[PDB]
Amino acid sequence: SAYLESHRASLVDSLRRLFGHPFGSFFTCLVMGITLSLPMGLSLLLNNVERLGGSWQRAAQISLFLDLKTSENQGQDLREQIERLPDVIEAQLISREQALSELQEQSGLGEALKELPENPLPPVISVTPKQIDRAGLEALRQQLAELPHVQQAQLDLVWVERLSAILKLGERFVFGLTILLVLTLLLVVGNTIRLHIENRRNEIEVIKLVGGTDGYVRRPFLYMGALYGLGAGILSWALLAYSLNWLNGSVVNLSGLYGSDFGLQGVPLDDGLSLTVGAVLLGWVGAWLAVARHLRELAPR
């Protein structure tokens, strides 16, 4: 119909009110921006750290040392069969000549078999699982102990149990911190929007006293909430990038010392769009809750 005039009037009124006394609006926008930037920054840092997830795993691999007499084709066959297990990531096959050099490098003793007729080092393989725990690893070792050609399985149980604890400690910390940050953001946005809505009461009273309707009294507050959300999103998206750029000056040195490039790249445009959309939606929901409270308080009873 011809109700677009309502939207036009609401939007121009919201812009006029927002552009008056700029500092009051700017401080609120900046507070919401920082409060939203915190959890988003944590999530982005976690995602960036996730790129190197292969190093955390593959640390406690179960050895499946074979017998001294083994056909090479049989070795590849057992490699393929172990690869078929649903609970294994990767399989390998180290050779005797490679094993000798591996022992020589770490041992530092150099010459080993001075007066020994033949090499007794048997062919060896490696197996890596998805998850690390004291029970699943023991169960998988028991499963692998009855293969056609296996004689030992040297898993260091004292270490594998420590690895499970040293990884579970990190998970709970992140979980609790995420919960706390989300709660803080929700409370801050809700309270700020509630205060701004409570500032205007006589308007609602007069509009409801005269013949009105819910939409015609609710629209301007929705527009104001949307504008505050967009402002907070823009402010937040222009500060997290600077923080990541400042922090990137130190991580590159450590990455170079390890001998690799792990530059902290941040704020892709998709993430910025998601952030601003989320801020707008949060403001829009907060405004609709705040208006609904006052509207319910004026029930005829």
Binding site: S55, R58, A59, Q61, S63, F65, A99, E102, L103, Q106, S107, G108, L109, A112, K114, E115, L116, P120, L121, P122, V124, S126, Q152, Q154, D156, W159, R162, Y258
Partner: protein, 150 residues
């Protein structure tokens, strides 16, 4: 002819015995040559099993020198701690393989014990043959006496 012919017959018998006596010195020389041959073999065999302590000491020192590592400084230093646990069982295999080498040295020691008991038996035989030469020495003393009558 009692002085001449009877003494000549005894001298001929003494010479016939002396032939086998020279033969037994010859076999004695052969036995002594193989005795020092076996003695040198035992000495060179006992030269072995000394490299046993040498190599075992080297491996023990190496194991202690790299057997003390907190695993948190292995993962954080790109030492790929997938190893340092395989090489623990690699050391177990090389210690059982050096135990097989030392079992070859136990073959050495048992062969030495056997080749010491039986070689002591051939020293008993050596005493017996020294005794039988001690029996086979009065022939020259007799020949000295019956030389005059010839």
């Amino acid at each position: 002819s009692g002085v001449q012919k009877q003494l000549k017959s005894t001298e001929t018998e003494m010479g016939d015995l002396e032939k086998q006596i020279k033969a037994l010195q010859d076999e004695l020389d052969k036995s002594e040559a193989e005795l020092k041959r076996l003695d040198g073999e035992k000495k060179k065999l006992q030269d072995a099993r000394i490299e046993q302590q040498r190599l075992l000491a080297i491996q023990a020192r190496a194991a202690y020198q790299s057997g003390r590592e907190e695993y948190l400084k292995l993962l954080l230093n790109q030492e790929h701690p997938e190893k340092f646990s395989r090489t623990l069982t690699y050391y177990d295999y090389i210690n059982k393989a050096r135990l097989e080498q030392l079992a070859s040295f136990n073959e050495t020691l048992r062969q030495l014990a056997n080749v010491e008991q039986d070689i002591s038996a051939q020293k008993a035989e050596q005493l017996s043959k020294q005794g039988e030469l001690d029996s086979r020495r009065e022939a020259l003393a007799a020949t000295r006496k019956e030389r005059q009558q010839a």
